Structures are given as structure tokens and as C-alpha cells.
Amino acid sequence: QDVVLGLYYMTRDCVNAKGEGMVLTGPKEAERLYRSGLASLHARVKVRIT
Amino acid sequence: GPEEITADIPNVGEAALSKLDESGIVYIGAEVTGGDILVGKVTPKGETQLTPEEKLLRAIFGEKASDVKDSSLRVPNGVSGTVIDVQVFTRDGVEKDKRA
Amino acid sequence: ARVTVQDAVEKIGNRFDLVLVAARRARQMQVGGKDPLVPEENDKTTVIALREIEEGLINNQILDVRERQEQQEQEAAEL
Amino acid sequence: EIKELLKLGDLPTSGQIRLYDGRTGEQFERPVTVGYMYMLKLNHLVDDKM
Amino acid sequence: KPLVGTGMERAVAVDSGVTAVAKRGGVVQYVDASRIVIKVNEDEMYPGEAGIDIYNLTKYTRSNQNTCINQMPCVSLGEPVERGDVLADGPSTDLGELAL
Amino acid sequence: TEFLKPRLVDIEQVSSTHAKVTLEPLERGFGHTLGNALRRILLSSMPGCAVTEVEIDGVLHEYSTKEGVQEDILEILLNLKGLAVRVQGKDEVILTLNKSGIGPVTAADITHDGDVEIVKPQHVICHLTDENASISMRIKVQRGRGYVPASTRIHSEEDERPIGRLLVDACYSPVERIAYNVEAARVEQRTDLDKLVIEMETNGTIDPEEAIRRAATILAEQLEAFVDLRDPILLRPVDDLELTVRSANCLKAEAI
Amino acid sequence: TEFLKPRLVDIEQVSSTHAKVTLEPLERGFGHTLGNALRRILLSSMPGCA
Amino acid sequence: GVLKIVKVYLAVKRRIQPGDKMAGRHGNKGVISKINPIEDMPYDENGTPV
Amino acid sequence: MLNTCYRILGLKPTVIFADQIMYTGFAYAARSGASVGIDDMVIPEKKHEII
């Protein structure tokens, strides 16, 4: 019940949050953007993944 | 034989008697912990049947076991309290102790 | 070994035969005084005898080969 | 009548204020319901159960 | 006390008999931690006796469930007390309101 | 590099318990770093004085009463927790309170020492209601930090205290409440600088400059693990050699 | 003032750019004080070229 | 047969604890899971923690 | 998601992945702040006219 709420909140989508459309060189700087407040949690970006 | 409420308890230290009074009942106001003695009481024993080895240990150091057996009321473990009251009831004709 | 015994149940084949082997090996390091083949790593005997099995050092035949061959040296020094 | 009594004490009428995290100092994303509930202590204590 | 109540806290506490309500109206004369002495008004005084009501509060006493019963006075020295007023709080009352 | 150092600029005293402290100039992101780190040290790691043991005469335990005293002893022992006492010279003083006559017993009845300063001298301790009644107590004030309950104290100290020494839980920490904000102060080139306004509500006993000076010393020294640091046979008795009994009358005669 | 200053007990180095640092024992309420005040500086104020 | 009885009254003082059951008036019971320090609890913009 | 891990990867990467889900679900449910007020229980405006 509480693990699913933090998962549903984190993997959600917002139309107008913050940092829309910026491009990221991996998942390790998607956490640098969230922790320093530069991006929102649910916000559509482009990530290079592997 | 009749059991008696005494402070003279066999095979116990002098710090275990540091909370009881001369009659063998704890002081009103004492701060007791688990295992501590509240009321010192003993029963008279029968005759003990010695083992072959324990017949030698008494015959080397010399400590005899008398007709006195410890059954004193102790604080139940896990409880740490403070004695606030003591009530002593006595049968008619039986002599009262110094705290009664 | 410690967290999971999943890697050990393929080297023996059964969940029920793993217990009857690893309790025979850990009996020897408890009361027999035999030496463990792996590093001890401050582990109990049940975790060592499970760790010995998953690195292929203990089987049901190896516990039968070494115990039968240990008697046949005692069956020589007496007679 | 509850939301008129919250205006008399200069509190938000939604009943939800903005809370900050105590360990990281960060602000929570959504406002949190804060108030005064009357709590009881029942007679099932862990000193008696263990 | 509860901040959000229901109006029925004052009728549970007085009717449980665990408080100490005043039988006759009058003026408080001497308050202790264990005794309340109220001097009765002249119009409520029957013409034979001295007209002094004295209340003795039950101090730290065991309940049935091994809890504490303790009555504390909630009036001060020299104030008027009407009939039915609350003089001593019970174990779980607060100025005559039930406070669980 | 292009860093900058802060400074203590303004200490506004609102009351005897409330204060405001401004720290400026800070760079961007350093207002919340020094703001939240100094909120956790001031709420948990500050020293202060508190009542530890109380000894009233004619009283054996805390569940008893007294003739003439309106409150129970469990209510007197919980009023002495809120006693605000600032001790200057020593680490442990023993006070004494003596009062006779009808009226409230306050903190202004304690026989004062030269270096012991009571902050709130109108703190109500007791209430005497009878004329012949007199209270007398010896209050022991210590100095520590944090919060130490009395159930630790009996389990630690095995020494026999006499019956009549009532123990109090000690909450030494003087700080009661603290909040902070990060505004922007004006600097003509560096417009991106910040300020830090730390509120501080407490009892007495602590200068609000000495609190932030001591909180920023506990923090600076906990970063020292980060910057610089990355014949046995001699004393035995004589009967352990199986000697001859003719020598047992010989060795003991010389007091060997 | 008898605070427990820790021992830098471990530097577990996985690669030439990865690390795990263990630091014990600390007073309670000082794992989040020193841990967060170092994380906010390593993310936002470390000088370097780009 | 009884010669004398001694009744001793103790007085214990129990504080709350992780495991002690607490409840409210609306049927919302529960047990305490942790006793958290003050500086880790969430606080509002005035500084008063929950 | 836990069942896809068990069928492709085994038992040992499932127990580790089921704990780290519980560490990440507990951490970001506290970063959000989720409550229930009396404004979250909404009413349709047309409730009186349907009755």
C-alpha cells in the first residue's frame, strides 16, 4: 500500500511541470536534476539509456 | 514446623538484606528492582539426601546446611517499582513482630 | 550460502537431500573436529557445510568415499 | 462553521499547511493536513505481552 | 480535556461518582491535598448542628485492573461553592469533564 | 575561485526568551545548507542546567502528601522541571528552599548563591494553605546536554542513596523552538547573495550569540574526519609446592 | 561537551571513479546532519570545467 | 493454618514504548513503531514540529 | 514487474530487486506528502437535481 503510492507518484506524467524537453546523458543526472531542484519528478524529457 | 518471617536468610549476601528492616519486611519508600527481596521468609526443611560427591564437598570445607530453607517473597522480574504500603495481618494469640 | 541456498540445490539435486548431506558434513566440523575446506570467514558449521557444497567440494559420494577409506586405515593399524 | 472558525484564528480554510522535511530541510511537494486529534492510550501494553 | 468534545463529558464524570461533588452550598475554608473543609451557608444550615461539610479524598489506591485511583482538589482557598459543584477531580476527569 | 564568507551582523532581542539572528552574506544554496544544519545541532546538542534530585523533609516517596500543601508531590516534582537556572562557575550546585505561611511558593524564595542566577523568579513551585505549615527542600541542579531519564540513573549507579531522595528526569536542553528563512540582501555587484534570519525561542540560561557560536563549533569539528582525516609464579602462596611439614614449622616462624 | 568523533574506518573503492565511504560511530542526529550538508555541496558548488 | 500475611504494594511508572497500542475515538487503533527525535520530525514555517 | 524478473533472471536477483522496490517506494512516498482533507472528497454540483 505505501510502496505502490511512491511508485505511482514517481512514475507519473505531468504536462507542465518543469524542465520539459531537455536531453539527459543517462539516469545518473536525472537524480542530479531532481535533488538540486532543477527538474520536477514527473516531467517529460529525453534520456539516453542502456 | 512453623514458617517464620525473618531477615536471617541462609546462603545470601549482606547487600540483599540492605533493604529489609530488622523484622524482614522492606522499608516503606524503598526503590526496588527485579529479583530483590521484599519479605524475608523461611520454611523448616526435612533431612536432605546427599550424593556421593556432595558428601565430600561438605567434608572438605565444612559448611553444614541447617533446618532453614529460603522461600522469601521477591519482586517479580521485569518490574521496577517503589514500595508505598505494607499491611501485616496476624492470627490471634500469635505474637506480633516489631514492625507489626 | 548465507542469504540464499539456491545455488546449492543444483549441485545436489533436491531440497530434501541437501539437508541430509549438509547436516552430515557440519556434524564432522562440530564434534568430529575435522577441518573445513573453505575459508572459515567466522561462520557457523551449517553455513560452512552449505558453502562447501556449492563450490563442488562436498557430495554424497565424497562423504562416503572419505569415511570408508578412513576406516580401512584404522582397520590396518589395529591388526 | 468550521471554515469560519479557521478564519478567526488566521489559519488556512483548507486545513492543510506547508510542511518542511526535518532531516533534509526540503519542502514537501503537496500541503499536509495538520491538526489536533485527541489520542488515547489503551490497556494493551508491551510490558504485559512480552 | 478534549478540544473537540460532544457536550456529554460533564454528565459522565459527575454521575460516575468518581469525583467529589458538594452536597450543600457554601464557602471553602481549608484546602489540603487530601481534605476539603467547606463552611455551609446559613440558609442551607439545619438549626441543630455546626454546619461544616468535610470531604476526605482517596489517595493512591489500586483499582481492579491494577491502575491508580487518585483524587485531586480543584477548588482554592476561600471561594463560593454551589450545590452540585465539583470539588475534587477523579482519576480521568479535568474540572469535572471526562478526559480519557 | 569566487567564494565569499558570512558574518554575524544583527542580534535583535524580542523578549527575554525570543531572539532573531541575521547571518550575511551567503552565496546561493548556502542559506539552506547552514540553515538546516544549525537547526539540528541547536535542537539537540546544547548544554544547560536542570533539576536532578530533590529532597523534601518528612517525605519518603513521590506518592505521598503533606499537611497544608495543596499539590501532591508528583505535582511539585513536575513543577521543578521547568525551573530555569543559569549556573556560572561550577557544574553542580545544591539549592535550598524555605518558606512559611499561607501563599504560593515561587522561585523567589530560594536562598541565592553569588553565581547562581534564576531566570524566571515567579515560577510557581507549590502552594501553602495552612498557617502552621512549612516546606523545606534541597534542590540539586546539574549540567549536561540532551535528555537523561531517571530509570537510567538507578540502573547505572549501584550506590545506595538514602530513602527520601526523589529523582527527577533531566531535560538539559535550553532551546525550545527555532525557525529560519533565507531572504535576499542587497549587494551592488553580486545580486545573487542571500541572508539567514534564524529565530530562536528558549528559556534563559543561553545568550543567543553563544548558542550559534557553539553550534557552529560542533559542526566544524565533526568535519575533522573529512578534511585532514580524509614472573607469574612469584606472588603465589607457599602451599603450592608440596613441601615437608618440618619446614611448615620453619617458614611460618620467620613470618615468610 | 564529549561528542564522539568518528573513525574513517573504510574506503571501499570499486573503480577509479567509484567509492563507498563508511564512517562510524557518530552521535545520533549527526548522520543526516553531516550526510546532507555534504550532499548539497557536492551537487551544487564544486568548481570544475565544462 | 495461616499464621500471618504480609501485603506489599508497589507503584510502577510506565512510559510509552514501541509496541504500546494507542487509538483514537473514531476506530483508528495502532501501535507505536518508533520514537523519533525532535529535529527529524516535520515542521511548519513557524518552526513548530509535529 | 517482480514476476518478469523471476522468470528471466532467477531467485537471487528477485530478492534484491524486491527489497530495493520497498526502499524506493517508502522514500518517494515521503518526498511527496500525501494527505486527505475535506476538500479531497468532492461532490458533483448536480447531486441535488438528480435526486
Curated annotation (Swiss-Prot), chain A:
Changing Q1P: Resistant to antibiotics salinamide A and B. Co-administration of salinamide and rifampicin or salinamide and myxopyronin suppresses the emergence of resistance to both antibiotics. Acetylated on several lysine residues in the presence of glucose. The RNAP catalytic core consists of 2 alpha, 1 beta, 1 beta' and 1 omega subunit. When a sigma factor is associated with the core the holoenzyme is formed, which can initiate transcription. The rRNA transcription and antitermination complex (rrnTAC) consists of RNAP, NusA, NusB, NusE (rpsJ), NusG, SubB, ribosomal protein S4, DNA and precursor rRNA; S4 is more flexible than other subunits. DNA-dependent RNA polymerase (RNAP) catalyzes the transcription of DNA into RNA using the four ribonucleoside triphosphates as substrates. Belongs to the RNA polymerase beta' chain family. This is DNA-directed RNA polymerase subunit beta'. It comes from Escherichia coli (strain K12). The chain holds residues 504 to 553 of 1407 of the full protein.
From Swiss-Prot, chain C:
Its EC number is 2.7.7.6. GO terms for molecular function: bacterial-type RNA polymerase core enzyme binding; DNA binding; DNA-directed RNA polymerase activity. One of its GO terms (cellular component) is cytosol. Disulfide bonds: none annotated. Promotes RNA polymerase (RNAP) assembly. Latches the N- and C-terminal regions of the beta' subunit thereby facilitating its interaction with the beta and alpha subunits. Part of the processive rRNA transcription and antitermination complex (rrnTAC). The complex forms an RNA-chaperone ring around the RNA exit tunnel of RNAP. It supports rapid transcription and antitermination of rRNA operons, cotranscriptional rRNA folding, and annealing of distal rRNA regions to allow correct ribosome biogenesis. Coiled coil: none annotated. One of its GO terms (biological process) is nitrate assimilation. The RNAP catalytic core consists of 2 alpha, 1 beta, 1 beta' and 1 omega subunit. When a sigma factor is associated with the core the holoenzyme is formed, which can initiate transcription. The rRNA transcription and antitermination complex (rrnTAC) consists of RNAP, NusA, NusB, NusE (rpsJ), NusG, SubB, ribosomal protein S4, DNA and precursor rRNA; S4 is more flexible than other subunits. It comes from Escherichia coli (strain K12). It catalyses: RNA(n) + a ribonucleoside 5'-triphosphate = RNA(n+1) + diphosphate. Keywords: DNA-directed RNA polymerase, Nucleotidyltransferase, Transcription, Transferase. This is DNA-directed RNA polymerase subunit omega.
Curated annotation (Swiss-Prot), chain D:
The chain holds residues 1194 to 1243 of 1342 of the full protein. DNA-dependent RNA polymerase (RNAP) catalyzes the transcription of DNA into RNA using the four ribonucleoside triphosphates as substrates. Resistance to the antibiotics salinamide A, salinamide B, rifampicin, streptolydigin, CBR703, myxopyronin, and lipiarmycin can result from mutations in this protein. This is DNA-directed RNA polymerase subunit beta. The RNAP catalytic core consists of 2 alpha, 1 beta, 1 beta' and 1 omega subunit. When a sigma factor is associated with the core the holoenzyme is formed, which can initiate transcription. The rRNA transcription and antitermination complex (rrnTAC) consists of RNAP, NusA, NusB, NusE (rpsJ), NusG, SubB, ribosomal protein S4, DNA and precursor rRNA; S4 is more flexible than other subunits. In pull-down experiments interacts with CedA. Acetylated on several lysine residues in the presence of glucose. The gene is rpoB. The modification N6-acetyllysine is found at K7. Belongs to the RNA polymerase beta chain family. Transmembrane segments: none annotated. Co-administration of salinamide and rifampicin or salinamide and myxopyronin suppresses the emergence of resistance to both antibiotics.
UniProtKB/Swiss-Prot annotation, chain G:
It comes from the Bacteria. Coiled coil: none annotated. Disulfide bonds: none annotated. (Microbial infection) ADP-ribosylated on both alpha subunits by the phage T4 protein ModA. ADP-ribosylated on only one of the alpha subunits by the phage T4 protein Alt. Belongs to the RNA polymerase alpha chain family. DNA-dependent RNA polymerase (RNAP) catalyzes the transcription of DNA into RNA using the four ribonucleoside triphosphates as substrates. This subunit plays an important role in subunit assembly since its dimerization is the first step in the sequential assembly of subunits to form the holoenzyme. Part of the processive rRNA transcription and antitermination complex (rrnTAC). The complex forms an RNA-chaperone ring around the RNA exit tunnel of RNAP. It supports rapid transcription and antitermination of rRNA operons, cotranscriptional rRNA folding, and annealing of distal rRNA regions to allow correct ribosome biogenesis. The N-terminal domain is essential for RNAP assembly and basal transcription, whereas the C-terminal domain is involved in interaction with transcriptional regulators (such as CRP) and with upstream promoter elements. This is DNA-directed RNA polymerase subunit alpha. It comes from Escherichia coli (strain K12).
